[PDB]
Amino acid sequence: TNIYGNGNNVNTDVGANGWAPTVSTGLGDGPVSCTPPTPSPGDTEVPPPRKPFTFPAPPTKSGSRFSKWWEPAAAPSSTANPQPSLIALNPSATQSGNASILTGSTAPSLLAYPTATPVPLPNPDEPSQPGPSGDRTWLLDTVTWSQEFTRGWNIAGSNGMQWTGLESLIFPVSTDTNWTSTSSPTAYPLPFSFVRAYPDSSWAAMYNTHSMWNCGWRVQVTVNGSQFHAGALILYMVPEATTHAIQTARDNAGFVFPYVILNLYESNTATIEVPYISPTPNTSSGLHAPWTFYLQVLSPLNPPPSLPTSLSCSIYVTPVDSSFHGLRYLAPQ
């Protein structure tokens, strides 16, 4: 029994073996398959913040392989301990490059997906990464929460892209035409709406002139209601897709993404830690914004009577372990 019984446990060929001398033989043919390339070295950078930047492959040999014909010879959530309500103290803090955010009560904080291993970069260059500026916590628009929002209202500040903007955005990027309309905006794509409102910041200075960019993102929202308010929020941090394919007026199964309910009962705060998910090592600048941050309402907050109906909140967004590759003339975006 050699090279037989492939993709066991099922009556089908699962391509268990990428290649065998046996498959594709003249006598018999199986389905084809593939194997990993190992494009030798390159500044091994892929997902933050595991990127070492040191190239495993020898540098400058440029050996080549085939012999040229013109040369003669060459060579948690566990029920063991339950987090108390916001009455109890339970301190916590989440820092960053310089700015930091204290909190009381219980702060749900998670790391959405575990950090993947590094992979050799296709291009050969040294990435230029800036310590803060371009780190710390940048404050996006402070959005107002209102009582009249029903379930799944997609509340957002002044820096978000409008619903119809999520389709037919146009060129190039911000035209100010899709960002200003009656009733807006549904949500902010993370790469595009961060540069907006922060051209001065170095991260902003970069990502214009550097072409491909690499960043992991972490988003943090802070809502403190009085001990008597009741409500909830969700932070989806949806990976790239049109809203129409992602969610339409339903949001019922939408917990498959990262979520971290705010739940104004026991919590003042929520964070998310997201490694960046994009095809190819580095996305191109000025296009292809991979993460989009939605903020939704599970239950309408009904405030204590005789007190103001509105309630206020802010959103803190920051990069993690940024990098860039390649230079060019400045591009607006």
Next chain:
Amino acid sequence: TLTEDLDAPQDTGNIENGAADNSPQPRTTFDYTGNPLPPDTKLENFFSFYRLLPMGGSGAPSLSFPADEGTIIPLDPINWLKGADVSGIAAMLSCFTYIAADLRITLRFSNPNDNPATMLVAFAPPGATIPLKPTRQMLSNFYMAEVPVSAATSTMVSFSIPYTSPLSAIPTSYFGWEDWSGTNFGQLSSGSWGNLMLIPSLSVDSAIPFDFQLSCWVAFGNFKAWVPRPPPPLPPLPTPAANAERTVAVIKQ
């Protein structure tokens, strides 16, 4: 066990953290025991079976291309989702953003007119310029197949296409542009598995050319899917209202 317990531990917890705890509570008088997982759940076993894809931008299941003209049959996983049905291969891949597999097509086509015929099926690896009007000589360099089709109808054929994309992972949804200057928003033409261009032929070359009709089954293999998304909506059952609560949860009472 022990039956009556004064001190038994509570079932309370917190679901606010992203992680959700699904372990069974140790209730008294209950012996909870794990179960082996039957191997219909794993992806690479579940996607190795053939399913029917919706053809073209819309108007599934079948495509009808008139004779003498080839159809390019785009394999973009982004084109399938457009006009995609609630149930089918179409909407199952909507659960994952990125997929990598060697896509195995089996296509069948039935010629209504009665003469035997031959289709010439070619695979243009992504990306590759598809000739605007294909010719037998030009179409042929790529890769060849000669499908004799029975005169009455229904002649099948299968194929095995390795994973050629340079994207490493092909997106099933892409938010951004393709061309630097141009528009083409919301899709990428270079992430996919080639295109199948196929040019019919008739030796008799009789009048009343007519139109061939086809449909194809597609089953991935050695499958990998990197990040999940929520599955598409399924229309719920109607409320009988005669005797409710038998099925369909009641609420708001």
Next chain:
Amino acid sequence: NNPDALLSTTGYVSIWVQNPLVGPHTAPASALVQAFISAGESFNVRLMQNPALTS
């Protein structure tokens, strides 16, 4: 006498609102916030001079 001069200052501090007060309608209207300043560790000085306020 030359307060806005180099080596004589460092940057500004500040205290900004972010989320305004909320509370039941029994609770008081306002709450004061008092700010103490005490030199931490490593604070050092030298070179005696008469107190530089009167002068």
